RNA sequence: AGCCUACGGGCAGGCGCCGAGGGUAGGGCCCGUGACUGGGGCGAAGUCGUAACAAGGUAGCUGUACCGGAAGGUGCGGCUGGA
RNA sequence: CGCGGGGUGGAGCAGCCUGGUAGCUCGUCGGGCUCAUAACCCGAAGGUCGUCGGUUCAAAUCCGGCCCCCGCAACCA
RNA sequence: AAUGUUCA
RNA sequence: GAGCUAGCCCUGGCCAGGGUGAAGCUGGGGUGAGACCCAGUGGAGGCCCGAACCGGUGGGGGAUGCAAACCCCUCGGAUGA
RNA sequence: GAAUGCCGGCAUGAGUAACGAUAAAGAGGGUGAGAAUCCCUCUCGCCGUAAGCCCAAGGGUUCCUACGCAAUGGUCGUCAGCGUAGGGUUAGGCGGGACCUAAGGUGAAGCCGAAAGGCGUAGCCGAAGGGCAGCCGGUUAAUAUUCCGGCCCUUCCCGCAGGUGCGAUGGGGGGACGCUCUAGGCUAGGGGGACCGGAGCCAUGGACGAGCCCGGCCAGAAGCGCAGGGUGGGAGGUAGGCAAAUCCGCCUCCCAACAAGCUCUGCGUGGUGGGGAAGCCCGUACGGGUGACAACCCCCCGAAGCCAGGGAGCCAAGAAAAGCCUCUAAGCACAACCUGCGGGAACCCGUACCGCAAACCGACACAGGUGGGCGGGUGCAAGAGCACUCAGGCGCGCGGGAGAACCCUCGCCAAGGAACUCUGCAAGUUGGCCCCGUAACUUCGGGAGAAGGGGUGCUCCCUGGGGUGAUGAGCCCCGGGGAGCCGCAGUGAACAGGCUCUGGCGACUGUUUACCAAAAACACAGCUCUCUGCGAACUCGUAAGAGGAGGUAUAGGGAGCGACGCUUGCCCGGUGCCGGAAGGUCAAGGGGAGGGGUGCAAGCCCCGAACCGAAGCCCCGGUGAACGGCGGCCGUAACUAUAACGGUCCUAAGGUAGCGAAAUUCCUUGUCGGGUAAGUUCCGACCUGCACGAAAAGCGUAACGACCGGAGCGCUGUCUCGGCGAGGG
RNA sequence: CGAUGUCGGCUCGUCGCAUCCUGGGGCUGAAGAAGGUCCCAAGGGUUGGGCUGUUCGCCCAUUAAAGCGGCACGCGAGCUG
């Protein structure tokens, strides 16, 4: 239900806004254990590391429950679907029968007023978390942990999802969103189902102002610089790079792989 | 137009203050040299 | 401010609305013409190739899509106006 | 004017570097196949090597001088 | 495994 | 040495006055149900004209100047990067 | 005797330029030795969303008063922001600190680093932010929300009096938050008034009249009244709020669903306190007295301000901690906490003055720059614009003459209107509001203020809506209709688009070379390639560590192209990148065939070939939205001409689509056609592209542009071709 | 080279003659007019536009003529850029 605008002014006929119908009447956030002061910054102690960062609207970091093994066997009731400006996906407010209030990365199809649980039993239903060794092979899963007892770290973006291909001893083969086949331990929890907000890929920023609102500064091309500032820079009008394309630091940016060859995690990867 | 000197008691006392000099070896050597030379004002006068 | 034959009237005259036409400006239809360009019809004996009619020597035709000096070729699907 | 590459049968290319013998394709001529042409098959002719010289016993081949053709360069104020 | 100028 | 300047961080402030009338709502129309069409309502946008404000397009003057970047006329933006 | 030598002094230009905005001065009197320049008075000119008031930064004696003018003041100066001396800045309520946290800084624990030192959860510091109890008048020459007067508050400490289990830096709530648009009632502010209060006035032809002119408020506890914000109330169970709670949270019933009720603001009213014009008389450098027993009332407009944490829409999703309430634990229930009343205690710093400027920043009394609040009245539709003008403040610290050239700024002009010139550069036309009326084209929004027009003042009469008013008079907004008057001219002055046609480039709003370039350059949404499995890739750092990111392939880094429509062809021979457990080579190392130097000797010391030896290179493949490249010579068609066609050489392949004398074309003002009287420019075509061409993108495209080129219309001193006048020199 | 500002235009001229015109003259294949060529002569005059930065040049309408050249390819302490 992607929202479109009329061409009453330029940069609007193409501007696109995501559908906010899934967001229930819960515009304000929660507290006691919820958004904390988010320290916005574009650099480390001193100089800038990640270039072209800054500006952007002010935000509050919604603390999410990535390690859902803290309340094993305890049910929960989905009471709301909120907006998180720090993530591409939607968050969900949970009210455990136990008494706590934590946010889970709202998966796709998860509606308000639904029971959810995490643990060994944990019936196979959208939103439930189980160890990978318990989930049936061929089911879509998200929020997978890399190593056990380290929190959810894989397939947690808008619309992303992983699939179980098979088991091997204490490890299970997972088809990550990038198509890479990975061996993940069986004790790593993972929330079954997709993530949702698949329309996030169809959104169109429209104008540069929307990019500035998101905190993305105008990226300057290397060819539009000087040789002191970039390897492609310099030369007379529109030089065709005159050399293999490279980054401002020298390393090439066209097919040059940069993964550490001698890595202990190499014997766990099967695909690209 | 706007010139380079825009007085500020706060900035002047924090950037050229006596405590700031003692915090770094550079400022310490600055005070050392000024003492050796016999300066009447080892640090900028701030009221 | 005039003239009158019956004058709380008329005439001449003055002002106003409309008003043919002229001017200004901008649209709509049609007609002629225009360097150049597109394909078309016709034109006894010009060049290149063989597409089709006999399984025309790759069955032919067709809608579409792409490519090719050119007929045309190929892909997808359809037809018997073929076996 | 300058720099470097080429002038070879009728057409297009080698052969030059390391001198002795000029080959490839097309084309032309004669004869085959066809009813006739093309295609194809069998034989053969065809070259003052741009020219003027000199080095050698000897020059397409090596060295000079001119006649053409091809490309590059002709900037600074 | 191509082709057969024009009219009768 | 970032009391100028460039960028970023935290915290505050400012932007007179006019227009254009997007979405959405309500009613009516339409259909088997819709799409959709009319009004009325509604006030969106790096929207429009134009002050404060931020600039610096073209001309003139200034040239041991008012000024080691100025003054006059004109000009761009002016709820947004 | 020279070095554009150094330091100092004095010459020249020279009594020349200038004397710092063209807002403006004139006169009488006084002081004084000396007044254009100091003081007073009268006339005149200027500002007035300021050139007027109030804070903040900065400045530091500049403020007041007395006595002075050698120097500072662009002249004088009796004057001063200058010298000498004296005086002057009063706080529990204003601001900051004995309160809080943010960026950030620091930093016990801890980590890192040759040393210096770097990082770092807790805590600490860290302020126009949070929290927090004062309003109105009088006084000095100089201080006031500080002193005084009135009224009203806040902390503590000690007591009594009544209640409750009190009780923590601990748990919970709360504090607490975006942008835009708005509702109801108020208040600030302002307009009017036949009502009220006033010293006075009849001028010059008329006016004793609802005549003229001035003024008709401020604050104010409880108690009221009017708006408005917050807030559901009980009974059970509970595993969570890192110990425990009656508190919070989660379930299950019963009543509210409402502001009904509790508190909490704002505003009127209120015991009472204060102020009170214009004019005249005075002596000031200025204020005093009277005016006064002042009166202190009624309408209308009305905020951007208040009730505030109000409401609604939207996406980009909008600080923390303390104060505050509540809950319980240690310990203690002789303690303690809440309320009322008494008595008592309440510190440290600033307070003068300038403060859009002569006191700050610019070496200067510099036409420059400098944050926040108030910023009135009338009219022009509106308004912080414009013109004039309250309050208030100035005439800019050299003047007096004259009426040349010439210069700046400004006005007007016969006839012609771009003939000027690189170009209509400049200047001129137009110009606001209301109503008609608007084309090709298009992304259906636009283009559109298209273009081109008409009305615009004043008077009289008739008539329709509202708002405050009781369904009414008035008062304030909006209209409509008909008669008439004047002038050359009715947004009668000031503020206020010239317009169209057609190309190049760029999609567009934006950004940049402060101090010569604002663009076709950069950026931009969007497309594509590539890398990156999370201790990610990349980046800063020797490291620790941090950013990425408290993000996870719809995410993040790099690169190119730059909306959008249609597209983006061939070559992997070379370079790069990617994939290849084969093979060649390949250093340290293993390894010892064999040899050497010394010893009488065991020995010790050297070299040292086979063979095993990674990366890398060679080798084998892929990959162009990777770096790059994408032919030559001949002949041919039944008029010529050209070549659909063929031959041959080479290459890795031999530029297709779409454009083309173009931001690209040397020859070149190529050749035709159009605009013109005439056109090296411009526009449309031809194609012979020296030397376009497909993401250093190609061909187009509505809209957009202080970009660049051409044309036309309207208009004009640009010009023929000058002339006159105004002010500043 | 411890500086001689270099194109073109505007303003201001001035000079040379081997003269565009006007004045005088001689031949002519000069009947006359109108021409051709040559000699003497500069006193004076030698237009306005379109294109281009132009000098130059090509056109438009004329003219008695629409001359050539020097003066730092005259002239920027005169201007334009
Ligand atoms: Mg809390
Ligand atoms: Mg830090
Ligand atoms: Mg630091
Ligand atoms: Mg870019
Ligand atoms: Mg550059
Ligand atoms: Mg640098
Ligand atoms: Mg650098
Ligand atoms: Mg480089
Ligand atoms: Mg450069
Ligand atoms: Mg180039
Ligand atoms: Mg380059
Ligand atoms: Mg009668
Ligand atoms: Mg056939
Ligand atoms: Mg067939
Ligand atoms: Mg066939
Ligand atoms: Mg094919
Ligand atoms: Mg088929
Ligand atoms: Mg050859
Ligand atoms: Mg050869
Ligand atoms: Mg034969
Ligand atoms: Mg040079
Ligand atoms: Mg050079
Ligand atoms: Mg044939
Ligand atoms: Mg700064
Ligand atoms: Mg700063
Ligand atoms: Mg508005
Ligand atoms: Mg509507
Ligand atoms: Mg609006
Ligand atoms: Mg705007
Ligand atoms: Mg605009
Ligand atoms: Mg504007
Ligand atoms: Mg303001
Ligand atoms: Mg500024
Ligand atoms: Mg700028
Ligand atoms: Mg300017
Ligand atoms: Mg410009
Ligand atoms: Mg200028
Ligand atoms: Mg000058
Ligand atoms: Mg404009
Ligand atoms: Mg604007
Ligand atoms: Mg000497
Ligand atoms: Mg000397
Ligand atoms: Mg000198
Ligand atoms: Mg000298
Ligand atoms: Mg002298
Ligand atoms: Mg004199
Ligand atoms: Mg002189
Ligand atoms: Mg003089
Ligand atoms: Mg003078
Ligand atoms: Mg002055
Ligand atoms: Mg006297
Ligand atoms: Mg301050
Ligand atoms: Mg101060
Ligand atoms: Mg003093
Ligand atoms: Mg004084
Ligand atoms: Mg005195
Ligand atoms: Mg003096
Ligand atoms: Mg003295
Ligand atoms: Mg003096
Ligand atoms: Mg001075
Ligand atoms: Mg005296
Ligand atoms: Mg003094
Ligand atoms: Mg104390
Ligand atoms: Mg504090
Ligand atoms: Mg604290
Ligand atoms: Mg603190
Ligand atoms: Mg901190
Ligand atoms: Mg140490
Ligand atoms: Mg540190
Ligand atoms: Mg810290
Ligand atoms: Mg403190
Ligand atoms: Mg504070
Ligand atoms: Mg505060
Ligand atoms: Mg206070
Ligand atoms: Mg005072
Ligand atoms: Mg007071
Ligand atoms: Mg008091
Ligand atoms: Mg208690
Ligand atoms: Mg307490
Ligand atoms: Mg009032
Ligand atoms: Mg009144
Ligand atoms: Mg009265
Ligand atoms: Mg009288
Ligand atoms: Mg009041
Ligand atoms: Mg309850
Ligand atoms: Mg507990
Ligand atoms: Mg209610
Ligand atoms: Mg009151
Ligand atoms: Mg009250
Ligand atoms: Mg009084
Ligand atoms: Mg008085
Ligand atoms: Mg609200
Ligand atoms: Mg909090
Ligand atoms: Mg604390
Ligand atoms: Mg409370
Ligand atoms: Mg103390
Ligand atoms: Mg004071
Ligand atoms: Mg004060
Ligand atoms: Mg101010
Ligand atoms: Mg000043
Ligand atoms: Mg100053
Ligand atoms: Mg000073
Ligand atoms: Mg000073
Ligand atoms: Mg002055
Ligand atoms: Mg100014
Ligand atoms: Mg300002
Ligand atoms: Mg106002
Ligand atoms: Mg006003
Ligand atoms: Mg009027
Ligand atoms: Mg008004
Ligand atoms: Mg107006
Ligand atoms: Mg205001
Ligand atoms: Mg004004
Ligand atoms: Mg006054
Ligand atoms: Mg005239
Ligand atoms: Mg006239
Ligand atoms: Mg005209
Ligand atoms: Mg002209
Ligand atoms: Mg013209
Ligand atoms: Mg001319
Ligand atoms: Mg021109
Ligand atoms: Mg032009
Ligand atoms: Mg102009
Ligand atoms: Mg006018
Ligand atoms: Mg238009
Ligand atoms: Mg147009
Ligand atoms: Mg329209
Ligand atoms: Mg109009
Ligand atoms: Mg009138
Ligand atoms: Mg009212
Ligand atoms: Mg009413
Ligand atoms: Mg009229
Ligand atoms: Mg106007
Ligand atoms: Mg144009
Ligand atoms: Mg062009
Ligand atoms: Mg642009
Ligand atoms: Mg384009
Ligand atoms: Mg722009
Ligand atoms: Mg610049
Ligand atoms: Mg510069
Ligand atoms: Mg400029
Ligand atoms: Mg610009
Ligand atoms: Mg695109
Ligand atoms: Mg660093
Ligand atoms: Mg490093
Ligand atoms: Mg990190
Ligand atoms: Mg992070
Ligand atoms: Mg990416
Ligand atoms: Mg990216
Ligand atoms: Mg580009
Ligand atoms: Mg299109
Ligand atoms: Mg390509
Ligand atoms: Mg290749
Ligand atoms: Mg390769
Ligand atoms: Mg290969
Ligand atoms: Mg490799
Ligand atoms: Mg070895
Ligand atoms: Mg060894
Ligand atoms: Mg190897
Ligand atoms: Mg022929
Ligand atoms: Mg061929
Ligand atoms: Mg091709
Ligand atoms: Mg062409
Ligand atoms: Mg070209
Ligand atoms: Mg023509
Ligand atoms: Mg032409
Ligand atoms: Mg053309
Ligand atoms: Mg190109
Ligand atoms: Mg390319
Ligand atoms: Mg482009
Ligand atoms: Mg194009
Ligand atoms: Mg266009
Ligand atoms: Mg522009
Ligand atoms: Mg355009
Ligand atoms: Mg003139
Ligand atoms: Mg004159
Ligand atoms: Mg004058
Ligand atoms: Mg020189
Ligand atoms: Mg010299
Ligand atoms: Mg002569
Ligand atoms: Mg003659
Ligand atoms: Mg004669
Ligand atoms: Mg004759
Ligand atoms: Mg003669
Ligand atoms: Mg020349
Ligand atoms: Mg001459
Ligand atoms: Mg010359
Ligand atoms: Mg010259
Ligand atoms: Mg000059
Ligand atoms: Mg010049
Ligand atoms: Mg000179
Ligand atoms: Mg130039
Ligand atoms: Mg210029």
Author numbering:
A (entry chain RD): 2 to 273
B (entry chain R7): 1 to 47
Paper quotes:
Here, we solved a 3.7-Å structure of the 70S-G299A ribosome containing ASLLeu (anticodon: 5′-UAA-3′) paired to UUC, that is, with a C–U mismatch at the third (wobble) position of the codon–anticodon helix. Watson–Crick interactions form between the first and the second positions of the codon–anticodon interaction (U4-A36 and U5-A35; mRNA-anticodon nts; mRNA nts numbered as +1 starting with the P-site mRNA codon). At the wobble position, the distance between U34 and C6 is too great to allow any hydrogen bonding. Monitoring nts A1492, A1493 and G530 rearrange to dock into the minor groove of the codon–anticodon helix, with inward rotation of the 30S shoulder domain towards the 50S subunit and the 30S platform. The base triple interaction between 16S rRNA nts A160, C342 and G347 is disrupted due to h14 widening. In the corresponding near-cognate structure, G347 and C342 form a canonical Watson–Crick base pair similar to that observed in wild-type 70S. Overall, the structures of 70S-G299A mutant ribosomes bound by either cognate or near-cognate ASL closely resemble each other. Mutation G299A is located in h12, ∼50 Å away from the 30S A site and ∼80 Å away from B8. Here, we solved X-ray crystal structures of these mutant 70S ribosomes in the absence of an A-site tRNA and in the presence of a near-cognate A-site anticodon stem-loop (ASL). Both mutant ribosomes adopt the closed (on) state when either cognate or near-cognate tRNA occupies the A site.
During protein synthesis, ribosomes select correct aminoacyl-tRNAs (aa-tRNAs) by monitoring the nucleotide (nt) pairing between the anticodon of the tRNA and the codon on the mRNA in the aminoacyl (A) site. Decoding is thought to be governed by a conformational transition in the ribosome—open (off) to closed (on)—that occurs upon codon–anticodon pairing in the A site. Ribosomal ambiguity (ram) mutations increase miscoding and map to disparate regions, consistent with a role for ribosome dynamics in decoding, yet precisely how these mutations act has been unclear. Here, we solved crystal structures of 70S ribosomes harboring 16S ram mutations G299A and G347U in the absence A-site tRNA (A-tRNA) and in the presence of a near-cognate anticodon stem-loop (ASL).
